[PDB]
Amino acid sequence: EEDASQLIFPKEFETAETLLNSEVHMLLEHRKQQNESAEDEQELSEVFMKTLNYTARFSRFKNRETIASVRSLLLQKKLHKFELACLANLCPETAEESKALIPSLEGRFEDEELQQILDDIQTKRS
Amino acid sequence: MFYHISLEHEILLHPRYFGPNLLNTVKQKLFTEVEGTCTGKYGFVIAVTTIDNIGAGVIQPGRGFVLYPVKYKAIVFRPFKGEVVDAVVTQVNKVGLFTEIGPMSCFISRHSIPSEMEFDPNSNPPCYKTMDEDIVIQQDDEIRLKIVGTRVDKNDIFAIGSLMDDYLGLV
Amino acid sequence: RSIFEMYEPSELESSHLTDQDNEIRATDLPERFQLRSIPVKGAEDDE
Amino acid sequence: ITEGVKPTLSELEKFREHNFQPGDNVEVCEGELINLQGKILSVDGNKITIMPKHEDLKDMLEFPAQELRKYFKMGDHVKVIAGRFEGDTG
Amino acid sequence: KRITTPYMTKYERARVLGTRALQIAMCAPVMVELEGETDPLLIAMKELKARKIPIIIRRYLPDGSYEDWGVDELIISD
């Protein structure tokens, strides 16, 4: 029954906080920078290394200011939380593309209203 | 998908750890415990971001073990069905295409993959070519995929995908 | 009711009774050529 | 002993099994009520009289054992009961 | 705004002494200079006399509330 396509998740996860690729990347990077210092400490594990080399190859904007700006211009809409991270991480080209991507956008907004958002996202990208 | 939630966990502390570094030991124990683990309720936890507060330790009767209920704000990775996420192809085999969904590794099958994607095993690096080429899905390449099924193999997440699309993947 | 609806697929394939096994027993050509992954077609002198 | 035998089709041949466990998903093969997936709640012999809980229909219909078929959406836990690789998961 | 009695009941005192003796027997840092003894119960008694036991008692009330007292906060009887 759990299907993000139809917007439905357990109660504990519905009140979750969405995270972006660049966001988790900078979080893990700051964690590594804090952990490498202070000698006599249990170094990182394979999970951290794979997560780091996984999220580093998908950093669309390393600037926390750009992350803040993009999340701010995105949250001004009426889309759910799930629609903020997927789209912010994917960054498609055109509105028809984004609608074919996320089936919830099918008939939820206007073609040009989404095309402008996609263009703004592609421009904010570094 | 990665999220940031506040979880709780109770941990016992042997009387030997009492002293000025009691709180430090509790935090250290929490880190060594809830990091990289997996539970069927919240999923696989990557790491812990912070700790809200350290509950009041309740010494047990007839046992020097005092338990602390600590609440920690940590990130968790629990992929659901239908979501689309990125990954890097790790290996191409005639049995299917391998990738890496962060802490998860998916696998695609020829049946799902279109009829164009035939095989190339005689070369040193196997690769699925959409019949008439035009797009490479070899190793060390960013490919998206739709999680059409999930699974947790005893604290081990492994989802499954499909492929027969062009605009969220490699263009 | 057919034996396939009763017996277990494991025992059925161990006993060799599927339509594929019937085709392999009926069709000519060696069994190892029919079982090869790629068919074994003809070939002219040029090829 | 002559009374109390009741042979089976296996005995007839020498001289159909339905493995529908609870919590599984089954559709409707034949019949006008085609394309309706539901959850398994009751289990019995031949006349199973399954009480599925289809989507968009809070009611619970009834179907025999022949008018059913194990259906699973593309991508979900699948366990094999009787098969060549019995005892395997994928 | 604590209303419970400011004295240490005998039950609480006995339980605290036993618990501290057990914690000491399990190799734990003492809270007082040992003059030359090895009995964990005696060490717990000395710690009580010195008012250095790191334990706070959670006395429950009939309604459900609870008041947390400290061995060094409330007065000791014996």
TrEMBL record, chain B:
Coarse class of the protein's main subcellular location: nucleus
Entry-linked InterPro entries: NA-bd_OB-fold, RNA_pol_Rpb7-like_N_sf, Rpb7-like, Rpb7-like_N, S1_domain
Every S1 motif domain range: 80-162
GO-annotated biological processes: DNA-templated transcription initiation
Gene Ontology CC annotation, any one: nucleus
Keywords on record: DNA-directed RNA polymerase, Nucleus, Transcription
Pfam families recorded: S1, SHS2_Rpb7-N
Family, per entry: Belongs to the eukaryotic RPB7/RPC8 RNA polymerase subunit family.
Cross-referenced PANTHER family: DNA-DIRECTED RNA POLYMERASE II SUBUNIT RPB7 (PTHR12709:SF4), DNA-DIRECTED RNA POLYMERASE II, III (PTHR12709)
Function according to Swiss-Prot or TrEMBL: DNA-dependent RNA polymerase which catalyzes the transcription of DNA into RNA using the four ribonucleoside triphosphates as substrates.
Protein's name according to its UniProt entry: DNA-directed RNA polymerase subunit
Originating species: Sus scrofa (Pig)
Gene: POLR2G
TrEMBL record, chain E:
Transmembrane segments: none
Keywords, comma-separated and alphabetical: DNA-directed RNA polymerase, Nucleus, Transcription
One GO CC annotation: RNA polymerase II, core complex
Keyword Transcription: yes
Major subcellular location class: nucleus
Keyword check for Nucleus: yes
Molecular function (Gene Ontology), one example: DNA binding
Domain of life: Eukaryota
Location(s), subcellular: Nucleus
GO annotation terms (biological process): transcription by RNA polymerase I; transcription by RNA polymerase II; tRNA transcription by RNA polymerase III
Similarity-based family: Belongs to the archaeal Rpo6/eukaryotic RPB6 RNA polymerase subunit family.
Role according to the record: DNA-dependent RNA polymerase catalyzes the transcription of DNA into RNA using the four ribonucleoside triphosphates as substrates. Common component of RNA polymerases I, II, and III which synthesize ribosomal RNA precursors, mRNA precursors and many functional non-coding RNAs, and small RNAs, such as 5S rRNA and tRNAs, respectively. Pol II is the central component of the basal RNA polymerase II transcription machinery. Pols are composed of mobile elements that move relative to each other.
Name under which the protein is recorded: DNA-directed RNA polymerases I, II, and III subunit RPABC2
Naturally occurring in which organism (per UniProt): Sus scrofa (Pig)
